Design an enzyme around this catalytic site. Structure first.
Site, PDB file in Angstrom:
ATOM      1  N   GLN A 193      35.103  30.754  48.616  1.00 35.88           N
ATOM      2  CA  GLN A 193      35.130  32.128  49.099  1.00 35.88           C
ATOM      3  C   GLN A 193      36.552  32.703  49.191  1.00 35.88           C
ATOM      4  O   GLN A 193      37.522  31.960  49.323  1.00 35.88           O
ATOM      5  CB  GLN A 193      34.441  32.181  50.469  1.00 35.88           C
ATOM      6  N   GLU A 194      36.655  34.028  49.096  1.00 37.62           N
ATOM      7  CA  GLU A 194      37.922  34.765  49.179  1.00 37.62           C
ATOM      8  C   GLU A 194      39.139  34.219  48.404  1.00 37.62           C
ATOM      9  O   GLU A 194      40.242  34.080  48.944  1.00 37.62           O
ATOM     10  CB  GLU A 194      38.283  34.982  50.653  1.00 37.62           C
ATOM     11  N   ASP A 195      38.921  33.950  47.120  1.00 34.50           N
ATOM     12  CA  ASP A 195      39.938  33.443  46.204  1.00 34.50           C
ATOM     13  C   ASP A 195      40.381  32.010  46.423  1.00 34.50           C
ATOM     14  O   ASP A 195      41.412  31.589  45.906  1.00 34.50           O
ATOM     15  CB  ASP A 195      41.158  34.372  46.162  1.00 34.50           C
ATOM     16  N   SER A 196      39.602  31.265  47.198  1.00 37.52           N
ATOM     17  CA  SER A 196      39.882  29.851  47.414  1.00 37.52           C
ATOM     18  C   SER A 196      38.865  29.165  46.489  1.00 37.52           C
ATOM     19  O   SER A 196      37.715  29.591  46.401  1.00 37.52           O
ATOM     20  CB  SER A 196      39.676  29.461  48.890  1.00 37.52           C
TER      21      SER A 196
END
Ligand SMILES: [Mg+2]
Ligand SMILES: [Zn+2]
Ligand SMILES: [Zn+2]
Lengths: 134, 1417, 49, 8, 107, 277
Positions: A2-5
């Site tokens: 999630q969120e660019d991880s």
DNA sequence: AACTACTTGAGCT
RNA sequence: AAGACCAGGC
DNA sequence: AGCTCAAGTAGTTACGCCGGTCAT
């Protein structure tokens, strides 16, 4: 992821995926003066001054250097230098506090001013970790 | 803090007094005679010569020595020494005043140049303001230069009276470098005013005179602006940095002290030996300089004064300049201990408020916990554990102010504690800590989290707490701070806990919702098609921690027992949660499964996505917070999460090129929507390259060409995408990720599957950088779209070089401001802050500052905390007079308009009661007062507004708390209801005061609410709509009351900093661009600066009452305002030679003469050829035109003209010693100082058809558009008194003006409106109170005080305060100059001092009541 | 870009000469009216006829 | 915006 | 209250504050064509007896200076003919409470 | 694989960074804002491509905004306090009669507009009728001589600073006063300030140039002192060795001394993270 | 880089 | 040890 | 000699948080 991880498959991280070597080179000289007063590359201890470091100097052969096999860490003095003034103040180099690894290549050399030039190189294998950027 | 107890009493600074050192004092204080310029070396021997530094001052080398006042280095603040200068010098920064003083005082004597005798002086002399007095004064005395000994008394200018004497003419002084010189006056006489001379004069200046000018006889006398004996600061000030032992190393100042010292020595040794009297001064100027240097080395008369090497040499004042420099660099913000920072990555298994901390870090950061018989046992364990085991500790400190290092001390594992000792333990789970991500522009950029030590090197934060800090995981880092006192912690957990933060005061709505995966999936899981079987419905219930341990009856039993997301997702929603929605085709059986309805805390119908679980208003979150509390709701996240995230883990989800491809035929249907769109361009290009089109008033023939091309391609592109939008099934992943509301929008799909779009810079399609072409690959003058930057291709297909390039040039502009507006936005932010800091609600409910100056009498004009407010709809206001009555009207004296006895329990026994029908009148008569009062506040009719206490829900709670049937009757006396709602109003107290003015404020700042209150508590509704029992009613009431009281603002609330950010924040999110009237980013700027010449001034004027949709009436005013000049209708002008005033040398003129001699001059002619088409546009007449001309010059210029019928309009004329020179100056005076129609400064004036809601006679509000004239320039005082306008609605965005014409008040109204429209023009919403507060602060002091170095930072606020922004040093100089006294009431002062500032938590005292401390036992 | 390169610095005269001997009537002696639409030529920013 | 349209 | 059409002489008006207690005002014609109070944005103001004033101050614990001000040459200030020391209660509509009550002293 | 191109000072690999700049010796015309006594103006930055290289520009202004009656044309010269009205600049050059002046500016007797514009200008200089006075009003015998100087070594110094070419510069100042008007009459736009073609990139090779000179020139006047003491070897070839090193090492072109008034950036520390880096 | 403050300059009685 | 400059991170 | 009005010229202040290389 999630969120660019992103999620990275450990298993193949082990089979060596995205592993990388890391080098570094701390370097020093032996300063002099037109007024014959030279520095030194030795394995100093006590001797009237105290001016010394916290870490260990034991991984230092008598030439004031480490060997390329040595596994250095924490702060371990990488080089040993001194300054006679008026009788031993330290100018020895310590492995950066956050670092560590293994010595990979030491070398002695002349300077235009016939001074003792010595650079040290340390290696480390860096493994991808739960935070590294890609 | 300090180390080693001091018998001296401990106190806190409650006041700061500024002034200037009187030479005698510096002498007094000095402990060093300081004569020698060297350092120490007793001839190479290291020590410290009794000469410079330490001739008793502080010291170096770890030597207690320091005048036996031992202490050694740390504990010994510095010790000042001095130095007797050889001759008086100018204090570098006061040289300005020193000069303005002389400009005001006479020499050879030394007294004022204007006594009470001079009238204009009395006035100045009464101006109470240490600064504006000395201001007004100098503005007077800088003129008179005759030390008058006699002037006319307060009687007859006949006789003269005497006062001080010796009228020696006073010289005019000027600034040349570091010396003041003047001339006395044929032809002047120049002399260079010495210092010694000036000082003497000052000393003589009278005491009541010091005071007349901005001085103070005790703390700072005018004379001390010149230094006699120089105060030499000690070591800690200018420390030395030795390179081990046998090597120098001296500070910068420790030099220009010596440079000065040396420039002093030589001087004196020239005044006690062969003193060549005019070769000394040449050496005096040097000392004056080195002393200018030392303090300031950044002046006018260049000579940077560099140190051997080129180095500039930091002047004392350099060490202070804001940012980096002491004030803003070391005091308003410092590096602190007990802090850490690394890389963030979110973790979906961490309670909203936690924050995973890498073991490593916890084993580094400690926490001083005093030994207490409750934790001794655990501490003695943590201690044995040592600093290397995680749940361990690393330092033990005994009463004897000394520290044991748990990793060395030979008694490491030994130590048995002693109550009272303190131990520094490793941070542990559930330790409140401040987590933040800068830029810190929010109250929420810093929040307290529960600590969770975890492995791996990274701060693990929850997703839902993402948007507050505004972080992502592409490498972003986070700072963490660790509280240290028992209260420090508490203060962190009771006000900064993440749960308390869920509802943001800036936009009175939550500010954390469900993002990405959790959102996206929660949507899927909701659809009617989503079913789950036992095996999973179980593992799902298990993941909800609060699970009651009860599996809900299957939504299906028949063949297979299944459940639906809607069901299980609901197990996360607490009981009592009532939510209602309604989207498009939404109705109690939502076909498309729209809307949202949750009763008793179970999803009834509708799908769940961004709208139902986002950081939105109706937000199930917003509601759960309000209804259950910070805690309950904070947990709600994790659950809704845990269930969903888990579910998604198994249902999977993805995206791939396949999601971006359009149907086989759709990709065609589009192509030809660009081809046809291409020709609808080629078409209007042909029709333009023929002059076959007219100029839309106000636009250039060319501009109007674009205006269409643009509007053609845009509409083309718009559907190009729309074809694909509806072409992507309910399975397209990209679509899904858009509906869920978790990423991207239409636009995105468009540019990826259809057409990328038109590229642009500075607002116009790709320019012609290459003479007449886009790229060298193009034919000149190609105005088409394939040249001007229209990318017809889709990303799925791929840009052609040209397309690919333009596209880059377009994006390039984008990247630009994202790299410019980034820090200029931050400045504008910073200002707002340093402009409201000291504003905080006060215990009486006044919003004031560090001066008590009332900025607002009741915060927000109601005293309510934005957090507790929601968008309610004031019923009363909207609807027809007909439908209104049928709702609230009750008539007990009527067969048809009375409460049917099926509603009330005394319906028949009540019908006809006269005494009751009267209480029922009071009521119905009221509601009407309201209805009309609300159309008096909100002329828009918009009935939706932010209002404390959500009554719609509060009643919905009664709804099912007592289970009411839409059948059997209530049980309330009509008195029960009506009387009861009156008793309520009585307890909704905001202000409390005993007297009336207060009691008035009460009613005042409440009203609006009460109306909302009546609206939902009218007998008719309360019984017929929501059948409330007697019980219910007494509950709803009691709650409205309670709720309200919590919704009030708390005295302490640091309101200013709040609104300051609340405003600047939604600005960091805007573009520097003013494309797609000057608005956005630059506009706000424009405003906060209180600009005197905005880019777009413009001004809107509405017609007069009557004539509204009068098309021609619009024009009839346009041409009576829009400034038209002869210059704009003249095609050419020539000056021929025609000597015969009865015929011309011109053909096409003949007629025009003869036909102008029925029903002296110069032989020199002047003809003007006006434009035909130009006389129809601005509309004009030869008769008029000339008429004007003629009366402009009048009787000394005969003029003639043809008639509107002709095929050539003309105007001849002559005058009446060289005429060819005169009749040419009169050429201009005709084309640039002569108006025909209009009011100056008012060019272009367009017309528009606007949307104006308004009161139909039949009640209801309806569409009644009315024409309006907008200008392109600004004059008011005049365009106001024009027949046909409504000088009750006119409006220019130039607030500057409005205030000047309509009174500061109306001014404020504008300032706000303009700021609001700047935030609102970006979609962002901020709550009134914020903008208002700003608006108000600028306004209150009387006019328009700008948010700039030349505004707030110039009021009567503290000195230390204003000093922490922009003019840092001078602000102090002219503060010790006039000897200012600082309250230390400013937030800043205290931060600078290191004392707890009067901020919420510190806006009061805490004392132990001995009396009660005895009754407790 | 990949293909871009920068100039280096050639010599003027081998082209000034190469010119005033192929149609370049030097500026020194000019007559605006006899030579109306005379295409003027510049060399490295200088007007050589 | 910039890379979509004027107005946008 | 003289209503000068275009303008009075600098020699003239320099004789106004020459007859106290009485006081005199000057109003340009072209500036009274439209009553400014009539404007939309202009909220209602109101004077205050040295009684109603010496009350506001006690009731709010104000030091006079701590009170929002209004300019002597303020369009509305002139209209109601204020003086240096007089107070004014402003009462306008408010989208938050309905009506707010502000006060401006005239400096 | 190392494509090289870098220097190796005191160990570390230093890479000289290209410095873009507005090319020289070219005519530019700029419109100057509504608030200004000047309407339009044309400039031309000039410098000898080889030899000293002066940095003094020519300003051919155009007073009188798009209205006022006095639309004159004056130009700025190096070392002259005030400005001179073009007419005089011509007579002071070698063209004394009117119409022979309009000869150079305008190339089409049938362009009355332009010519008109010039009219008011002619009147400005109508008071100075020859080469004597021409070179005078530029502030006797002492002043007149200096007048010449600023025309043969300062005025549009490129072209050549020789002597008998007065004529040539005149046609330029004519081609210039032309370019000015060509715009003030809406026939040619204001010069495109960012038309890359008119910007130059001082690569490595060039940099050493302007740098070397600064050096060798201090060596030049150094060798002058040894020769100014011998009342009857010396060349310290360290100023050209150590001088070069300083710059290339840090990134401060301009010398050292109390002259930080240079530019840092030129010459950096060659990247070695990746090849494409 | 742009404005805005502050003081100065030249035109004008 | 302090500073300056270049580089790079969200 | 003296005064209002416009213009010039002077000067100031700006930006969140977080490794290498050089030299006084
Ligand atoms: Mg990021
Ligand atoms: Zn001491
Ligand atoms: Zn006197």
């Amino acid at each position: 992821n999630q969120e660019d991880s992103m999620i990275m498959n450990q298993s193949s991280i082990d089979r060596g995926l995205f592993r990388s070597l890391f080098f570094r080179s701390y370097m020093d000289q032996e300063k002099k003066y037109g007024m014959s007063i030279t520095e030194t590359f030795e394995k100093p201890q006590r001797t009237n001054t105290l001016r010394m470091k916290h870490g260990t100097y034991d991984k230092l052969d008598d030439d004031g250097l480490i060997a390329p096999g040595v596994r250095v860490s924490g702060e371990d003095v990488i080089i040993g230098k001194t300054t006679p003034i008026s009788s031993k103040r330290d100018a020895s180099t310590p492995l950066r506090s956050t670092e560590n690894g293994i010595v990979d290549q030491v070398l002695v050399t002349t300077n235009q001013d016939g001074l003792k030039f010595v650079k040290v190189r340390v290696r480390t294998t860096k493994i991808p970790q739960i935070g590294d950027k890609f | 803090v300090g180390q080693q107890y001091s018998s001296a009493p401990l106190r806190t600074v409650k006041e700061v007094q500024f002034g200037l050192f009187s030479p005698e004092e510096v002498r007094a204080i000095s402990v060093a005679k300081i004569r020698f310029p060297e350092t120490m070396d007793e001839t190479q021997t290291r020590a410290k010569i009794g000469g410079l530094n330490d001739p008793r001052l502080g010291s170096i080398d770890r030597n207690l020595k320091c005048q036996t006042c031992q202490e050694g280095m740390n504990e010994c603040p510095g010790h000042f020494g001095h130095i007797d200068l050889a001759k008086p010098v100018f204090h570098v920064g006061f040289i300005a005043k020193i000069k303005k003083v002389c400009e005001c005082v006479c020499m050879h004597c030394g007294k004022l140049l204007l006594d009470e005798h001079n009238e204009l002086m009395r006035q100045a002399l009464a101006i109470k303001d240490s600064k504006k007095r000395f201001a007004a004064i100098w503005t007077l005395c800088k003129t008179k230069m005759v030390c008058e000994t006699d002037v006319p008394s307060e009687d007859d200018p006949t006789q003269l009276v005497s006062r001080g004497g010796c009228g020696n003419t006073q010289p005019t002084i000027r600034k040349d470098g570091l010396k003041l010189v003047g001339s006395w006056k044929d032809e002047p006489e120049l002399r260079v005013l010495s210092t010694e001379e000036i000082l003497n004069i000052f000393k003589h200046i009278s005491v009541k005179d010091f005071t007349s000018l901005g001085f103070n006889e005790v703390f700072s006398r005018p004379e001390w602006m010149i230094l006699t004996c120089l105060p030499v600061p000690p070591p800690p000030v200018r420390p030395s940095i030795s390179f081990n032992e046998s090597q120098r190393g001296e500070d910068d100042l420790t030099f220009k002290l010596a440079d000065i010292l040396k420039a002093n020595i030589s001087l004196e040794t020239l005044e006690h030996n062969g003193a060549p009297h005019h070769a000394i001064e040449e050496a005096e100027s040097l000392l004056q300089f080195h002393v200018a240097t030392y303090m300031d080395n950044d002046i006018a008369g260049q000579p940077q004064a560099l140190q051997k090497s080129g180095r500039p040499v930091k002047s004392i004042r350099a060490r202070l300049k804001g940012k980096e420099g002491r004030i803003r660099g070391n005091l308003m913000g410092k590096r602190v201990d007990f802090s850490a920072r690394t890389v963030i990555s979110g973790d979906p298994n961490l309670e909203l408020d936690q924050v995973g901390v890498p073991k490593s870090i916890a084993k580094t950061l400690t926490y001083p916990e005093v030994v207490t018989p409750y934790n001794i046992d655990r501490l003695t364990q943590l201690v044995r554990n040592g600093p290397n085991e995680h749940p361990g500790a690393k330092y033990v400190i005994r009463d004897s102010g000394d520290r044991i290092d748990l990793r060395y001390s030979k008694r490491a594992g030994d130590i048995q504690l002693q109550y009272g000792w303190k131990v520094e333990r490793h941070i542990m789970d559930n330790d409140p800590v401040l987590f933040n991500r800068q830029p810190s522009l929010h109250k929420m950029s810093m929040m307290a989290h529960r600590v969770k030590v975890i492995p791996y090197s990274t701060f693990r934060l929850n997703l839902s707490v993402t948007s507050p800090y505004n972080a992502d995981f592409d490498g972003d880092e986070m700072n963490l701070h660790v509280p240290q006192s028992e209260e420090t912690r508490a203060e962190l957990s009771q006000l900064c806990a993440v749960p308390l933060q869920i509802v943001s005061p800036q936009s009175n709505k939550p500010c954390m919702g469900i993002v990405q995966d959790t959102l996206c999936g929660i949507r899927k899981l909701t659809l009617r098609d989503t079913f789950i079987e036992l095996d999973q419905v179980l593992n799902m219930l298990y993941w909800v921690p609060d699970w009651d341990g009860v599996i809900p009856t299957p939504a299906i039993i028949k063949p297979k027992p299944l459940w639906s997301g809607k069901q299980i997702l609901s197990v996360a929603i607490p009981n009592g949660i009532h939510l209602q929605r309604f989207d498009e085709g939404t109705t109690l059986l939502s076909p498309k499964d729209n809307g949202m309805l949750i009763i008793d805390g179970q999803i009834i119908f509708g799908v769940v996505e961004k709208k139902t679980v986002g950081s939105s208003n109706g937000g199930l979150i917003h509601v759960v917070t309000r209804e259950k509390g910070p805690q309950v709701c904070a947990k709600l996240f994790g659950n809704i999460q845990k269930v969903v995230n888990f579910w998604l883990l198994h249902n999977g989800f993805s995206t791939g090129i396949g999601d971006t491809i359009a149907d086989g035929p759709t990709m065609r249907e589009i192509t030809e929507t660009i081809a046809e769109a291409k020709k609808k361009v080629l078409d209007v290009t042909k029709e333009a390259q023929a002059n076959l089109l007219t100029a839309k008033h106000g636009m250039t023939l060319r501009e109007s060409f674009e205006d269409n091309v643009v509007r053609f391609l845009n509409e083309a592109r718009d559907k190009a995408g729309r074809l694909a939008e509806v072409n992507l099934k309910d399975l397209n992943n990209v679509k899904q990720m858009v509906m869920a509301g978790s990423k991207g929008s239409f636009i995105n799909i468009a540019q990826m599957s259809a057409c990328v779009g038109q590229q642009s810079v500075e607002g116009k399609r790709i320019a012609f950088g290459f003479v007449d072409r886009t790229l060298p690959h193009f034919s000149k003058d190609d105005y088409s779209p394939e040249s001007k930057g229209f990318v017809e291709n889709s990303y799925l297909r791929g840009l052609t070089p040209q397309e690919f390039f333009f596209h880059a040039m377009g994006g390039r502009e984008g990247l630009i401001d994202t790299a410019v507006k980034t820090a200029e936005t931050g400045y504008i932010q910073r200002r707002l802050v340093k402009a409201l800091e000291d504003i905080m609600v006060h215990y009486d409910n006044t919003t004031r500052n560090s001066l008590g100056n009332v900025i607002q009498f009741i915060y927000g004009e109601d005293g309510m905390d934005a957090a507790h407010i929601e968008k309610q709809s004031l019923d009363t206001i909207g609807g027809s007079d007909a439908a209104f009555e049928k709702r609230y009207r009750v008539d007990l004296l009527n067969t048809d308009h009375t409460l049917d006895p099926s509603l009330l329990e005394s319906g028949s026994e009540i019908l006809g009661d006269l005494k009751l029908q009267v209480l029922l009148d009071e009521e119905y008569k009221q509601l009407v007062k309201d209805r009309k009062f609300l159309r008096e506040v909100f002329v828009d009719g918009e009935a939706n507004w932010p209002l404390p206490v959500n009554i719609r829900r509060i009643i919905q709670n009664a709804q099912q708390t007592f289970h009411i049937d839409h059948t059997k009757p209530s049980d309330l006396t009509i008195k029960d209801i009506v009387l009861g709602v009156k008793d309520l109003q009585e307890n909704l107290l905001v202000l409390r005061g005993k007297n009336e003015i207060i009691q008035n404020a009460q009613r005042d700042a409440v009203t609006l609410f009460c109306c909302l209150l009546r609206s939902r508590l009218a007998t008719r509704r309360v019984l017929q709509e929501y059948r409330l029992t007697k019980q219910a009613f007494d509950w709803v009431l009691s709650n409205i009351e309670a709720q309200f009281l919590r919704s009030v603002v708390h005295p302490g609330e640091m309101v200013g900093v709040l609104a300051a950010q609340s405003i600047g924040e939604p600005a960091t999110q805007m573009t520097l661009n003013t494309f797609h009237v000057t608005s956005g980013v630059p506009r706000l700027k424009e405003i906060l600066n209180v600009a005197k010449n905005m880019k777009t001034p413009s001004l809107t004027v509405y017609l007069e009452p009557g004539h509204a949709a009068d098309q021609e009436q619009a024009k009839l005013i346009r041409s009576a305002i829009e400034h038209t000049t002869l210059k704009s209708v003249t095609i050419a002008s020539e000056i021929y030679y025609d000597p015969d005033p009865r015929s011309t040398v011109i053909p096409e003129d003949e007629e025009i003469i003869q036909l102008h001699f029925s029903l002296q001059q110069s032989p020199w002619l002047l003809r003007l050829e006006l434009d035909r088409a130009a006389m129809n546009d601005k509309d004009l007449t030869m008769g008029q035109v000339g008429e004007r001309i003629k009366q402009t010059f009048k009787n000394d210029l005969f003029v003639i003209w043809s008639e509107d019928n002709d095929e050539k309009l003309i105007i001849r004329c002559r005058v009446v010693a060289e005429e060819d020179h005169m009749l040419k100056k009169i050429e201009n005076t005709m084309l640039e100082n002569i108006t025909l129609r209009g009011v100056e400064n008012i060019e272009r004036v367009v017309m528009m058809k606007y949307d104006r809601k308004v009161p139909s006679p039949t009640g209801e509000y309806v569409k009644e558009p009315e024409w309006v004239l907008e200008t392109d320039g600004v004059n008011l005082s005049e365009v106001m008194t024009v027949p046909g306008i409504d000088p009750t609605r006119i409006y220019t965005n130039s607030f500057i003006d409005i205030m000047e014409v309509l009174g500061i008040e109306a001014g404020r109204a504008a300032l706000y409106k303009e700021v609001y429209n700047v935030i609102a023009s970006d979609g962002s919403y901020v709550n009134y109170r914020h903008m208002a507060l700003l608006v108000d602060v600028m306004t209150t002091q009387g006019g328009l005080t700008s948010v700039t170095r030349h505004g707030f930072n110039r009021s009567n606020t503290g000195a230390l305060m204003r000093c922490s922004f922009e003019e840092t040093v001078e602000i102090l100089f002219e503060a010790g100059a006039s000897a200012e006294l600082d309250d230390c009431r400013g937030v800043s002062e205290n931060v600078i001092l290191g004392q707890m500032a009067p901020i919420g938590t510190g806006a009061f005292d805490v004392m132990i009541d001995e009396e009660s401390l005895v009754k407790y036992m | 870009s990949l293909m871009s390169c920068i100039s280096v610095g050639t010599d003027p005269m081998p082209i000034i000469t190469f010119l005033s001997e192929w149609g370049m009537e030097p500026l020194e002696d000019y007559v605006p009216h006899q030579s109306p639409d005379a295409t003027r030529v510049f060399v490295n920013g200088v007007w050589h006829g | 915006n910039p890379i979509w349209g004027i107005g946008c | 209250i003289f209503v000068y059409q275009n303008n009075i002489t600098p020699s003239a008006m320099k004789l106004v504050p020459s007859i106290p207690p009485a006081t005199i005002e000057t109003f340009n014609e072209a500036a009274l064509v439209v009553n400014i109070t009539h404007h939309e944005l202009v909220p209602k103001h109101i004077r205050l007896s040295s009684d109603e004033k010496r009350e506001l101050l006690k009731r709010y614990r104000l030091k006079e200076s701590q009170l929002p001000r209004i300019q002597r040459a303020d369009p509305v200030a002139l209209y109601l003919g204020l003086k240096r020391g007089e107070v004014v209660k402003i009462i306008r509509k408010s989208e938050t409470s309905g009506r707010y009550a502000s006060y401006r002293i005239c400096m | 694989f190392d494509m090289g191109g870098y220097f190796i000072i005191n160990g570390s690999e230093k890479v000289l960074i290209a410095q873009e700049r507005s090319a020289g010796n070219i005519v530019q015309v700029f419109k100057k804002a509504a608030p200004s006594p000047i309407s339009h103006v044309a400039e031309i930055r000039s410098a000898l491509e080889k030899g000293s290289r002066f940095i003094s520009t020519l300003q051919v202004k155009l007073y009188g905004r798009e209205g006022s009656s006095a639309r004159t044309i004056k130009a700025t010269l190096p070392y002259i306090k005030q400005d001179i009205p073009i007419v005089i600049i011509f007579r002071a050059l070698g063209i004394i009669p009117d119409g022979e002046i309009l000869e150079h500016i305008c190339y089409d007797v049938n362009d009355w507009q332009m010519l008109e514009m010039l009219k008011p200008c002619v009147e400005d200089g109508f008071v100075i009728q020859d080469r004597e006075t021409a070179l005078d009003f530029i502030g006797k015998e002492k002043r007149i001589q200096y007048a010449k100087d600023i025309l043969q070594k300062e005025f549009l110094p490129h072209i050549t600073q020789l002597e008998g070419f007065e004529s040539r510069k005149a046609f330029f100042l004519g081609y210039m006063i032309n370019r000015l008007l060509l715009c003030a009459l809406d026939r040619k736009d204001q010069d495109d300030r960012d038309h890359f073609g008119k910007k130059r990139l001082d690569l490595a090779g060039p940099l050493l140039a302007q740098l070397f000179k600064t050096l060798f020139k201090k060596l030049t006047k150094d060798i002058f002192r040894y020769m100014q003491r011998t009342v009857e070897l010396a060349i310290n070839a360290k100023t050209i060795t150590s001088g070069l090193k300083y710059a290339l090492a840090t990134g401060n072109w301009g010398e050292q001394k109390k002259a930080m008034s240079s530019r840092a950036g030129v010459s950096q520390v060659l990247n070695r993270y990746t090849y494409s880096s």
